[PDB]
Amino acid sequence: MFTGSIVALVTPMDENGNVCRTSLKKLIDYHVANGTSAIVSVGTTGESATLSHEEHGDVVMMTLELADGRIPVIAGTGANATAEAISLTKRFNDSGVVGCLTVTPYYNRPTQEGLFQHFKAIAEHTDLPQILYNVPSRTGCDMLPETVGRLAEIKNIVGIKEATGNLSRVHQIKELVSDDFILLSGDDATGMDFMQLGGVGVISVTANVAAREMADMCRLALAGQFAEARAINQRLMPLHTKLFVEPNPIPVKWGCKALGLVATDTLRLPMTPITDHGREAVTAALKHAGLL
Amino acid sequence: MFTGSIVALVTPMDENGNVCRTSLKKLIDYHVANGTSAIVSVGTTGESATLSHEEHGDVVMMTLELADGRIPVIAGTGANATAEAISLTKRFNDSGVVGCLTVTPYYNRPTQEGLFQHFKAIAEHTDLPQILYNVPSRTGCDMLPETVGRLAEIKNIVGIKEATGNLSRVHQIKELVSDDFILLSGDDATGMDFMQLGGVGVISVTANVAAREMADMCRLALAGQFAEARAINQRLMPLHTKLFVEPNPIPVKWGCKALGLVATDTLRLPMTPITDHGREAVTAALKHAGLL
Amino acid sequence: MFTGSIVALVTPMDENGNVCRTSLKKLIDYHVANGTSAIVSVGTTGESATLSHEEHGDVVMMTLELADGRIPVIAGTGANATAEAISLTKRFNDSGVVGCLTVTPYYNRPTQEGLFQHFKAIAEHTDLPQILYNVPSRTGCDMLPETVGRLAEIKNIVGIKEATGNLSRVHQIKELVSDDFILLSGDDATGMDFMQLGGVGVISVTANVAAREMADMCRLALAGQFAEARAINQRLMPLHTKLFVEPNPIPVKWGCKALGLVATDTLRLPMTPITDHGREAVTAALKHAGLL
Amino acid sequence: MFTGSIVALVTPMDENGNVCRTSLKKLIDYHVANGTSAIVSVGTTGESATLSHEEHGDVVMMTLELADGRIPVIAGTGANATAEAISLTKRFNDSGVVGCLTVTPYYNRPTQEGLFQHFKAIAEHTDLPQILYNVPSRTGCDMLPETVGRLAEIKNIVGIKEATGNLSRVHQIKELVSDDFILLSGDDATGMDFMQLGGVGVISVTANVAAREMADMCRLALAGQFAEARAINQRLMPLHTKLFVEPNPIPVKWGCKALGLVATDTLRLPMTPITDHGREAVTAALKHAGLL
Ligand SMILES: [Cl-]
Ligand SMILES: [Cl-]
Ligand SMILES: [Cl-]
Ligand SMILES: [Cl-]
Ligand SMILES: [Cl-]
Ligand SMILES: [Cl-]
Ligand SMILES: [Cl-]
Ligand SMILES: [Cl-]
Ligand SMILES: [Cl-]
Ligand SMILES: [Cl-]
Ligand SMILES: [Cl-]
Ligand SMILES: [Cl-]
């Protein structure tokens, strides 16, 4: 279930920055039709930072309702306060999600023992499988493999989205966890390499605009057909790069609009509409992938 | 008013993580007695991350009440959502605070134009002076001198707490702003250097445990007595270093406890109590400064 | 020929810093007996910096003589002046070496076009296969995959020792070169990962003290036995780490002494004898690998 | 003598990469006429890496002959082998130079104790004042303030060219050395800040094309006229930046040609002629400074 191409889904908004149900329906039908394994709802790519807990809950429950059992949903439940993370966790108990994606606390920079106490306390308040999420570029906190090893001993801590692009982390973590602990890439440009080294999938920004290609690449990689997977990776590499020409998710929301998947690429401040330079880059990348 | 030694005040807590009014009274009395210019209430050092908006308001209001006009109070009002920053800003308008300290959005990594629109929107919803706060190690976002320069043209944006320790930024910023724009260090180990280059004070962690020494150093630096100011700096340099032996504010909360200023050095998860290694380092630094 | 475990051989010295022929004989006999694919003579690990061109020539020629056709020898020929690199290259033409290992110019930081002209000029003054060597931590110069791709089109430039530990570079380079172009790890702690991604061996420091284990790991990796190769990698990981506890080759020269392979671990200034802290770390790593 | 604007002089070359005496005469007459305090001959800016010891000696002795006692000369004597550094040091004993500029060993990355033994051994073989030179971006080795402190106890180790642009090093070093130890900037963009913090001059790339302005800025800074010095610094800041648009000394040699100070901007491989983009940047910077 937590293998293959998992999309970190955009939260589509109207002109006013309010969630657009018509666009969210189009996105979810697209993922159902194009082999996406699961949807991560309100991760970083889904603008977790600018949605209230109430709006956050509403987006996850709308995603579940529109999925209609056709595709599993994972709830973004990260917070930099343990109390707040437990609150989000309890909100999604018996919601219908299959698990939670929970980021390392950002801004306050806990110690590794702080990370252990944070995720242990969260895991205690749910039966839902927990996927840890390390992205030190954004958080200022790097959860080291030793800490991942310690947390992997807790029953419902089942995996990690490793977003560093540091490919030595795959076997550094595998050495300290059981064989069924799930390793997922959170870095699109190194996802293929990550899976070649033994990772079992990607939680992907690229999947938003290249669902079929990402699903195919992950299937081929998991089957050990690395040459065939890499030919797809090379078609997608301009997207893997240029979807971060401006901070995620500014480029990918314009990408979704360019493909007619969303009505508008509106984001909530402080995130801003894509620049002309950014738009030109994403256009070229989409064309290279044969999608425009 | 925004000059000299400004303390980034700890939020003292009991064993259960509730704010300790008895300890907060002792802290405020200590700053009034020892020459501190102003108090920043609920900044990074004040555990802004793990307080609710409601608890955040209560700590600022309790700080104003106990200060009783004896020392000015600046509200921490930072948020990574523009709507949330505006709501925090409105909560403190007409409260009695003299200004706001507002950090660059963390985790979501806006563009420089995003930072411009963020702080512009905040400045438009207040009468209060706004001090920008740049700490990319924690936020993943570096507000560049060019952007500070653009924001300095907005009426209510009056200065910046520059915490990078990049001392080139003093004159890179001064070159782009009026002589009236306030430059304050947010990096204790380079605060003396920052003032010698033309900065007009420090928003200080070290001031929590060495208020008199920091007030004297800033006074002598502003008076051009660099030799005398630097002799105090050398007495404090072990504190400037070792108060970050673990992530701020883990060490400084233990330091306040060791000096009898707070009853407990309890923090809120995910922040954790100081390690034995940390305790020994802070003990040695306090003794070096002649404070234990 | 340029596959498997290739040792970056130490230049053994007596107490006066003169090359020890008795120790060099023991080292070469050890590599022949323990499956090493080839010897790099006077690379970084061989103290290229502190040997004269004349002493450099003598060490390579003595290595060829003692090898006596039993194991191929690659000459270190790197220099930060193109004229000097050509002169070194000419010194080893018709010597009996099978190829040259030529580092990116250090200290003077040429452009990518400068690197192109440097290695093009060297390649034009030789019949010998050339292995590029990229180690920006030491040189201040990072040869990018694009530049490797341009150089790979020159007849005598046959591969690269990529020492960054950036595992993304395996397929970034492979994408721009023929299947014949040789990719070798120059980073011992990521060498196993590098081979699993499609690298065909390692130019190794660890091979100096664990020749049999490194030969077995590279053989199993090239055969696709990743699980068995990784079990050897885990036995060696303390060596892969602790052989850089002080700058290479300070630790590995002590390691060779501890195993009886050299009489003294003397280096030439400015390189210094291992510290007690370093000696203890290398002792513990050798014992972990079952070699003491 | 080792105060004010010291030029790190370019080594002017004809089309063949041979030293041009006519151009070297023009350069030295220019520095004599425009207030330059001293000439550093065959530093990094003088292409130390691509000149043989013989050619190196010839450039320093030609610089002395053309100076004709009108301006002091400091010899570049750095090498990454202690033996080689002693050889260069002995070459300039009783040459007529007033001192030596000696860089931290590059590429081989000695320990701090290695740096101490290197510079101690060099200082023993001369009566000439030695100026240490820290530029870790180029060398891969960072000489820390504690090491500078230890070396400052040796009689003829008299100062340091600190090229990091880390302005906290000024008082970190001053705290550990006597008041007469000489601190010079090796980073043009932070030279003014460095002198404001107590540095006594610059060993400058910018001085090659803006000798009069750099001499004036250093005189005003040393006299405590910081506002007047900074107005000159702002006129020069495009040069301080764009003279590193490509690695030094590629831009500054074109700059010297553009001002008619040298016949050609030829460099020795692997250094390359300035790109069109580079030329446009240096042109704009020279115009901003009012020099074209
Ligand atoms: Cl909800
Ligand atoms: Cl990251
Ligand atoms: Cl990597
Ligand atoms: Cl690929
Ligand atoms: Cl910072
Ligand atoms: Cl100081
Ligand atoms: Cl490297
Ligand atoms: Cl492994
Ligand atoms: Cl000479
Ligand atoms: Cl540097
Ligand atoms: Cl700095
Ligand atoms: Cl300035």
Put simply, the answer to whether C234 touches A189 (Cβ < 8 Å) is no
**Which residues in chain B have Cβ-Cβ distances shorter than 8 Å to A83?**
50, 268-269
A278 touching chain B per CB within 8 A: no
- Entry field: residues in chain D: 292
D230 touching chain B per CB within 8 A: yes
Domain with residue D50: its CATH number is: 3.20.20.70
Output the CA–CA distances (angstroms, integers) from residue C44 to A186, B56, C8, C40, C236, in the order listed: 36, 57, 8, 10, 21
Amino acid identity of D20? C
- Whether C74 maps to a domain, the answer reads yes
> Which experimental technique did the depositors report for determining this structure?
X-ray
Is it true that the peptide bond before B251 is cis, omega within 30 degrees of 0? no
The burial of B121, by beta-carbon neighbours within 10 Å (0-12 exposed, 13-18 middle, 19 or more buried), is given as: middle
Q: Which residues of A are catalytic?
A: 133, 161
Q: Copy the structure tokens of residue D202.
A: 């610059």
Residue position matching structure tokens 């293959």: A4
Return binding residues of B for pyruvate: 45, 203
Q: Quick one: how far is CA B39 from the chain centroid? A: 8
Q: How far is the CA of A117 from the centre of ligand 1 (A)?
A: 26
Cross-strand partners of D40 = D8, D74
The alpha carbon of residue C151 is apart from the nearest alpha carbon of chain A, in Å, by 21
Domain hosting C39: range is 4-226
Structurally, chain B folds into a number of domains equal to 1
Q: What's the first-to-final CA gap in chain C, in angstroms?
A: 31
Q: How far is the CA of B187 from the centre of ligand 11 (A)?
A: 11
The alpha carbon of residue D194 is apart from the nearest alpha carbon of chain B, in Å, by 9
Residue position matching structure tokens 């041009």: D20
Q: How far is the CA of A61 from the centre of ligand 1 (A)?
A: 6
Q: How far apart are CA C15 and CA A89, in angstroms?
A: 66
What residue spans of chain B are helical by DSSP H? 21-33, 53-67, 82-92, 112-124, 136-139, 145-152, 169-174, 191-196, 211-222, 226-242, 250-258, 276-288
> Which residues, in sequence order, are CB contacts of A47 under 8 Å at separation 6+?
A10, A11, A249, A267, A268, A271, B108
The burial of A125, by beta-carbon neighbours within 10 Å (0-12 exposed, 13-18 middle, 19 or more buried), is given as: middle
A107 touching chain B per CB within 8 A: yes
Put simply, the answer to whether C193 touches A189 (Cβ < 8 Å) is no
**Which residues in chain D have Cβ-Cβ distances shorter than 8 Å to B173?**
none
The one catalytic residue in D26, D30, D161, D253 is D161
- Residue D263, phi-psi category: left (phi > 0), alpha (psi -120 to 50), beta (remainder): alpha
Question: Could you tell me which chain D residue has the CA closest to the CA of C113?
Answer: D272
Mutate to test the interface with C, among A169, A193, A194, A232 (most CBs of C within 10 A): A193
C190 touching chain A per CB within 8 A: yes
Tell me phi and psi for residue B38, to 5 degrees: -160, 165
Put simply, the answer to whether A50 touches B108 (Cβ < 8 Å) is yes
DSSP structure string for C171-189: HHHHTTS-TTSEEEE--GG
Output the CA–CA distances (angstroms, integers) from residue C93 to B22, C48, D211, in the order listed: 83, 18, 48
Asked if C239 contacts C285 with a C-beta cutoff of 8 angstroms, the reply is yes
Question: Could you tell me which chain D residue has the CA closest to the CA of C109?
Answer: D247
Question: Could you tell me which chain A residue has the CA closest to the CA of C176?
Answer: A234
Put simply, the answer to whether D170 touches B189 (Cβ < 8 Å) is no
The alpha carbon of residue C169 is apart from the nearest alpha carbon of chain A, in Å, by 10
Mutate to test the interface with D, among C44, C89, C111 (most CBs of D within 10 A): C111
Kind and range of the H or E element at D83?
helix D82-92
Mutate to test the interface with D, among B164, B171, B232, B241 (most CBs of D within 10 A): B171
Q: How far apart are CA C214 and CA A168, in angstroms?
A: 18
Nearest by Cα to B39 from B91, B2, B93, B90: B2
Nearest by Cα to D97 from D140, D65, D144: D65
C244 touching chain D per CB within 8 A: no
Ligand that lies nearest to the alpha carbon of residue B220, given by its number in the listed order: 6
- Whether D292 maps to a domain, the answer reads no
The overall longest dimension of chain D from CA atoms, in Å, is 48
**Which residues in chain B have Cβ-Cβ distances shorter than 8 Å to D196?**
196-197
**Which residues in chain C have Cβ-Cβ distances shorter than 8 Å to A168?**
165, 167, 189-190, 193
- Whether B231 maps to a domain, the answer reads no
Question: Could you tell me which chain A residue has the CA closest to the CA of B273?
Answer: A114
Ligand that lies nearest to the alpha carbon of residue B192, given by its number in the listed order: 6
Q: How far is the CA of D186 from the centre of ligand 11 (A)?
A: 13
The alpha carbon of residue C177 is apart from the nearest alpha carbon of chain D, in Å, by 23
What residue spans of C125-224 are helical by DSSP H? 136-139, 145-152, 169-174, 191-196, 211-222
Q: How far is the CA of A107 from the centre of ligand 8 (A)?
A: 32
C235 touching chain A per CB within 8 A: no
- Whether D166 maps to a domain, the answer reads yes
Q: What 8-state DSSP symbol labels residue C224?
A: T
Q: Copy the structure tokens of residue C10.
A: 């130490």
Put simply, the answer to whether B170 touches D190 (Cβ < 8 Å) is no
- Whether C279 maps to a domain, the answer reads no
Q: How far apart are CA C64 and CA C73, in angstroms?
A: 7
Is it true that the peptide bond before B270 is cis, omega within 30 degrees of 0? yes
The one catalytic residue in C26, C133, C242, C257 is C133
Nearest by Cα to D217 from D43, D74, D36, D38: D36
Output the CA–CA distances (angstroms, integers) from residue A88 to A54, A55, A56, A85, C135, in the order listed: 10, 12, 9, 5, 46
Q: Quick one: how far is CA D46 from the chain centroid? A: 9
C230 touching chain A per CB within 8 A: yes
DSSP structure string for C83-108: HHHHHHHHHHTTSS-SEEEEEPPPSS
Q: How far apart are CA D162 and CA D180, in angstroms?
A: 16
The one catalytic residue in B26, B30, B133, B242 is B133
**How many other β-carbons are positioned within 10 Å of the β-carbon of residue B127?**
8
**Which residues in chain A have Cβ-Cβ distances shorter than 8 Å to B268?**
81-83
CA atoms within 13 A on the CB side of A276: 0
| Helix, strand and coil percent figures for chain A, each rounded to 5 | 45, 15, 40
Three-class SS string for D164-175? CCCCCHHHHHHC
Ligand that lies nearest to the alpha carbon of residue A189, given by its number in the listed order: 4
- Residue A181, phi-psi category: left (phi > 0), alpha (psi -120 to 50), beta (remainder): beta
Cross-strand partners of D13 = D19
- Whether B207 maps to a domain, the answer reads yes
Q: How far is the CA of A134 from the centre of ligand 9 (A)?
A: 58
Chains D and A touch, contact meaning at least 3 pairs of CB atoms under 8 angstroms apart? no
C175 touching chain A per CB within 8 A: yes
Put simply, the answer to whether A111 touches B250 (Cβ < 8 Å) is yes
Nearest by Cα to D248 from D16, D45, D27, D35: D45
Question: Could you tell me which chain D residue has the CA closest to the CA of B168?
Answer: D190
CA angle (A122, A126, A128) in 5-degree steps: 105
Cross-strand partners of D266 = none
Q: What 8-state DSSP symbol labels residue A13?
A: B
Please confirm, yes or no, whether D106 is among the known catalytic residues.
Answer: no
Resolution (A): 1.9
Kind and range of the H or E element at A185?
strand A182-185
CA angle (B30, B31, B33) in 5-degree steps: 65
Q: How far is the CA of D231 from the centre of ligand 12 (A)?
A: 7
Question: Could you tell me which chain C residue has the CA closest to the CA of A174?
Answer: C230
CA angle (A200, A205, A207) in 5-degree steps: 70
**Strand positions, DSSP E, D57-215:** 73-76, 99-103, 130-134, 157-162, 182-185, 201-204
Torsion over CA: B189, B195, B198, B202 (sign)? positive
Considering only the beta carbons, identify the residue of B47, B139, B272 that sits closest to A113. Answer: B272
Interface of A with B in 119-148 (CB under 8 A): 121, 137-140
Put simply, the answer to whether D49 touches C107 (Cβ < 8 Å) is yes
Please confirm, yes or no, whether D133 is among the known catalytic residues.
Answer: yes
Nearest by Cα to B37 from B212, B166, B198, B188: B212
**Which residues in chain D have Cβ-Cβ distances shorter than 8 Å to B192?**
171
**How many other β-carbons are positioned within 10 Å of the β-carbon of residue B62?**
17
- Whether B127 maps to a domain, the answer reads yes
Considering only the beta carbons, identify the residue of D168, D192, D233 that sits closest to B165. Answer: D168
Tell me phi and psi for residue D151, to 5 degrees: -75, -30
Asked if A106 contacts A139 with a C-beta cutoff of 8 angstroms, the reply is yes
Residue D3 annotated as lining a ligand binding site: no
Q: How far apart are CA C170 and CA C67, in angstroms?
A: 31
Q: How far apart are CA D271 and CA D267, in angstroms?
A: 6
- Whether C267 maps to a domain, the answer reads no
Write down which chains contact chain A via at least 3 CB pairs under 8 A: B, C
Q: How far apart are CA B63 and CA B267, in angstroms?
A: 18
Question: Could you tell me which chain B residue has the CA closest to the CA of A105?
Answer: B270
